[PDB]
Write a protein that binds this DNA or RNA. Structure first.
Length: 228
RNA sequence: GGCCUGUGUGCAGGUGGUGCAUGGCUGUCGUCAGCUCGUGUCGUGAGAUGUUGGGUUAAGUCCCGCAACGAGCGCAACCCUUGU
């Protein structure tokens, strides 16, 4: 099953990898040809793995599951956040707090405090406290809001995790593999293929490629959720 | 029965000993800013992380970074006096 054409991936800059000094040697089965110090990824393998990943995510969300959108690099932050908000899944955009999946019982209390803070703001009580403590509450609210945005709606813990640039986000993929959750990720030439259960070859550093692939998986989630 | 006088019987009474058996109270490092815990992670383990780095402060005071996220006893505040 395919959604985006080989030519769309070609002019989207999806086959451009990193240099020949940083490649993970396990990606010799993805890398297709070397041209001018850039490793070029195999598009046929890309679409075979895209078929596999699409089937997996569709099955998961059609059974009633959640897909975590994880992105920290500036190229993927805005795109991932926008598409996750538009479809209705939890997302991570700014920074991954260590121990959010494997330690949810603790970080969920921070979400409870976010509920409490927003609820006490909605009551409108401002001048009933110290005018310094109110400011401290406001920056505390800003911190929690900028830290936890999709996990705010997430609650009942994820079913699969979709991550961009595994190499940057090693903490998330490690926690997911520790919990036994399958990992869906985009892989550049410097990302280990063995630590991703459902890999999609791709370029992580380009905003065009990031947006295209992550919106592909968002569309998959949308169709599967509609299939519920 | 209240009451003491007696003879005894228990017994009282010990500023007698051990602060190297103790409780309680107090000095001291020092009113110095530090000391820890929960869950998570790393290590076979003792343990480490957090509490490290940059900046700032009277201060582990606070901000920004970070496999950590929080919390407690401390700092500050609430109390009295003095200045309008």
């Amino acid at each position: 099953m395919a959604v985006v054409t080989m030519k769309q991936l070609l002019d989207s800059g999806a086959h451009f990898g990193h240099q020949t000094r940083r490649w993970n040697p396990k990606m010799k089965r993805f890398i297709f040809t070397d041209r001018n110090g850039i490793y070029i990824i195999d598009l046929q393998q890309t679409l075979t793995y895209i078929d596999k990943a699409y089937e997996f995510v569709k099955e998961t969300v059609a059974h009633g599951g959640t897909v975590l959108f994880v992105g920290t690099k500036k190229q993927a932050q805005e795109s991932i956040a926008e598409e996750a908000t538009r479809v209705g899944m939890p997302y991570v955009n700014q920074r991954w707090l260590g121990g959010m999946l494997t330690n949810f019982s603790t970080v969920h209390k921070r979400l409870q405090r976010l509920k409490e803070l927003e609820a006490m703001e909605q009551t409108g009580g401002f001048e009933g406290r110290t005018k310094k403590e109110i400011l401290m509450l406001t920056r505390e609210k800003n911190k929690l809001e900028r830290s936890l945005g999709g996990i705010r709606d997430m609650q009942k813990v994820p079913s699969a995790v979709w991550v961009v640039d595994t190499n940057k986000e090693h903490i998330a993929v490690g926690e997911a593999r520790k919990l036994g959750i399958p990992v869906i990720a985009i892989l550049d030439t410097n990302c280990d293929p063995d630590v991703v259960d459902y890999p999609i070859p791709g370029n992580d550093d380009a905003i065009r490629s990031a947006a295209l692939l992550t919106k592909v998986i968002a569309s998959a989630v949308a169709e599967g959720l509609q299939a519920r």
